Design a protein around this ligand. Structure first.
Ligand code: F6P
Ligand code: F6P
Ligand code: F6P
Ligand code: F6P
Ligand code: MG
Ligand code: MG
Ligand code: MG
Ligand code: MG
Ligand code: MG
Ligand code: MG
Lengths: 319, 307, 307, 319
């Protein structure tokens, strides 16, 4: 179902006009609108499971909203218009626009708790992860199964005060850290991609972002392990009376359980996997990735969009 | 509909298992087989107007064969499972696998005349083409528009005895030549893409190949011009009381006039446009180009298939 | 002399062993060490005019240090072992290792004033620059020359409190911004290279970094303009009775006036110009750019070193 | 000694003006002249060991001619201005311009015999070659040591009537053939390059070309084995009374024996390793490879040559 890439293409192109303009909500809204317009044109019967929030504080792509033209089987729809609106609003690297689709009911509930602790690797270390052990243990286990020196392991980590210990422990291990200021959907995918220069994603980030990353891991190979991370005892009580086993280790398939899973993403700014939107006299280029669990096929898709006429402008070159 | 790339992806993956094995027919047939299998699983209602040939000497993708499951409007379908299967069999560069789709009835008749004189150039210099003028004047006007000296120009020409005069005339002007043994669909698309190393395509080649190239040009921009080139007086006989004016310059739209044109190609061997199929233990990678006329969107598609 | 790439190759290979380890000084020092070791083995007679700083608080590549074995004429030498070592330490993109060489005495004084307001653009639009005009008018004139809308433009600006007004004014016009935390040598070279995603560099940054960028621009084309930006009245004091007119617009040649200018850089981490150093069992690959003013030849150099 | 790449850059740029122009001698002469002018500017003390012939039928770069500015140690110089002038003159793929430099006296004598039988592989099969065994044996041995299926082996072979048996035997093995019409210096290097799509070069080609390929193999890793291949009994007698053991198997180090070996090459037409000369409004690009035995460093060098003024033209983009 390659056509879904046009949804993240439209989101990235809409957000491209807000890159560096210091207005996170302006580019968010632009991306959301462009993506909803395109997803309703697609032959698919979606319900927004991960979106912009719930029916009020989210005017569009709210949790529960129906999407697609009506035609198609009913499925779960997850969208992150920009994974890290602040990267977009400041014009820094690695902002991406994201969607995932899976069988109806197979996506974990993103409202369970705001945060989850995470660790993710690529397929050749997919069975040695233990999110309950310290990071040094995970690093050494991944290092050995990969036959690498620990000092050549690279761990992607959100730069946050709450990660002071995790960062220290990775360094004391001797491994390296790629500090990111936002975007652990992108950081999760780079850990799982075979030869990307990051071996591991570790740390607490958003629960919706963990689920969307699980969808991509479901298609691409690898594993993420996660645990819900209540912010305080109030939120801990909520998740407990809601039925959640706060000791459960969530695996990739726990977060997205369908057998038909689809993921795609388009660069908004230049990143370690996707180039951002680039502008030219005649139009723009987008750079996307598309993948499916059923076939395991992964597609890199570079597109030249004519922002109008034919023969009016020069031809277009693609790296 | 992007899904149509899987047809050339299937054709190339099948043809790539025959690259460099010395068997034109074995690779050609595997490619036909795979593309027919896959085209009948896409949501189209198509009719082959360009393919392997007539129903008798061609069991698959024959003229008139209905392809697709098939939903959608009925439309013209044009396949070239490998544009120059000799390239594939000898392991040479620039073998591609190609299909085009357009509104039903909007493709030129591939059987009017076997051969067509062609000239094709990209968007920047399309406006200066005139296939009735001598090749020297097209070269100098294209070169001027491109801000190149004539000696910077590189003209792609099929290596054939029939092109001795054309080749002499291009050499006389001072331009460089890229002689190709086969494949003037690939050669035409290269003339129209930037930074390909080819600035112009010229000479006589297959009429079906001219039509497929025009479908691509409808999508990515540029222009091809063409004039039917009857082999003998019997074909000129056949051509004129079919109703064809052979002083008529065919433009891109005369060859493919649909408002809804689709084109895609996948590399079989490495070329100046697309990498060829690469195999490895877990799978294979294909490199494709996809384009549509109504949007003008051109897509480069690298696919890692896990077999 | 192409051989000088090995100095930045050595600086980057040393700095790459520190990428992502949280130690600014450890990577910076390893890079200094490796570049000093290697520069003294090339056939040059150079004098560091831009490096690590004064002889007291900088043992290596200090101001005045003679480098090379050394043959050849005496010349100006300028090193930046890592342009923004924070980038290296946090594993962020666009860390490069840089050197420039020019005729002796032809580089501007890096110590006149600490900071310089800059604007830099590539060859196509260099002729429209005016650093005295408002940033909005430079953007619209550059954009027109490039045949871009203003909203297609991407302006690179160091993320600093001092740039709040500049950033507001660029946002007011509608252009996009690429905010960088460090490294306006890399940012300047990116403004001047095509298809980099950056169309313009603007704002205040280090005077030594402006000079190194100008050496590069002397070689690959484009223009930088600059105006000294004294921090306090004491520096304006210092600047004026040094003899500087601070209504004076500095052009590229005012910063580096040699007829013989050399520039090279090697990637430390991945950037919009150069891939970073990649290690593997047998060895490592570096990605470099090399350029000279008298020929204008620009060289991209990928090196597979077997360790 | 990176500056030597400017010699093959000048040869390729001079030959670029003759690509497809149907005049092999015209582009040969242009390349020869441009290369000699640049090599005499280089600080080096060369004697042309492999050149355009001997002092008469070769006006320039003749066997024995001295090259370089005088400064420098004395060394052996081998130059092939275009490896396959017919590829150049017809505008077909894989024409390259080549030079090699080694310690004085360490290059085999290219006049010993016109032809030599050859087989070459990359470093991971460098010890399983036996040029005296049939090709099927070599293919299976290389296939096993590389852990590949034979049917995935690709053998580069000059398309020649004299190779009818060799071609048949490769196919009957099940391996694939990349037929080339000229240029077994380029075909040798592609066999030795690790992931180029050709695994093997086999067959009889020119003796100078085998020696130049040995120089590149000396730097890059791999091995070539060769035997002289007399064209008739007249030539067989010559090589015999000259002292040559016609049964000797020549190894890489027999063909080029120095410990300081240098090789570089520049594309003239587009090839499987180097792009050809490409022209632009402002100038041209060349694509070169440079390597040294002493360090084993291999350099890919893409250069933009301004065929004149600064700021007068557009900027330049490199894949
Ligand atoms: O910004 P917080 O509160 O630390 O939460 C982290 C989350 O924010 C993002 O960086 C951007 O929304 C996500 O990538 C990540 O999951
Ligand atoms: O081989 P012929 O008869 O000259 O016809 C040329 C045609 O053959 C092909 O090389 C493939 O059969 C086409 O690319 C080209 O149009
Ligand atoms: O960090 P400051 O004081 O604003 O100075 C900016 C300078 O710092 C650097 O980021 C590196 O120190 C340079 O690229 C830049 O010119
Ligand atoms: O052309 P011949 O006589 O078969 O000899 C082969 C030689 O010719 C070349 O193809 C070009 O001179 C060389 O690459 C090869 O060594
Ligand atoms: Mg997010
Ligand atoms: Mg990885
Ligand atoms: Mg064909
Ligand atoms: Mg700096
Ligand atoms: Mg030769
Ligand atoms: Mg190989």
């Amino acid at each position: 179902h390659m056509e879904l890439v046009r949804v993240t293409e439209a989101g990235a192109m809409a957000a491209g006009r807000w890159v560096g303009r210091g207005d996170k909500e302006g580019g968010d809204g632009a991306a959301v609108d462009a993506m909803r317009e395109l997803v309703n044109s697609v032959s698919m019967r979606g319900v927004v499971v991960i979106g912009e929030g719930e029916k009020d504080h989210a005017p569009m792509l709210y949790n529960g909203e129906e999407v697609g033209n009506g035609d198609g089987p009913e499925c779960d729809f997850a969208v992150d218009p920009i994974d890290g609106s602040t990267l977009m609003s400041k014009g820094m690297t690695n902002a991406i626009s994201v969607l995932a689709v899976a069988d109806r009911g197979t996506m974990f509930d993103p409202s369970a708790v705001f945060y989850m602790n995470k660790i993710a690797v690529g397929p050749d270390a997919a069975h040695v992860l233990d999110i309950t052990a310290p990071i040094s243990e995970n690093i050494r286990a991944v290092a050995k199964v990969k036959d690498l020196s620990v000092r050549d392991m690279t761990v992607c980590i959100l730069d946050r005060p709450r990660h002071a210990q995790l960062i220290h422990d990775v360094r004391a291990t001797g491994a390296r850290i790629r500090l990111i200021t936002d975007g652990d959907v992108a950081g999760a995918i780079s850990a799982c991609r075979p030869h990307s220069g990051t071996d591991l994603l570790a740390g607490i980030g958003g629960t919706p972002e963990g689920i969307i990353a699980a969808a991509a891991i479901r298609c691409m190979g690898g594993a993420i392990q996660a645990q819900l991370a209540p912010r305080d005892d109030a939120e801990r009580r909520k998740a407990l009376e809601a039925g959640y086993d706060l000791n459960q280790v969530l695996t990739t398939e726990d977060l997205v359980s369908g057998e038909n899973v689809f993921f795609c993403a388009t660069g908004v700014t230049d990143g370690d996997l996707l180039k951002g939107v680039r502008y030219y006299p005649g139009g723009c280029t987008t750079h996307s990735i598309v993948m499916r669990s059923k076939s395991g096929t992964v597609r890199m898709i570079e597109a030249y969009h004519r922002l109008s006429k034919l023969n009016e402008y020069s031809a277009i070159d693609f790296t």
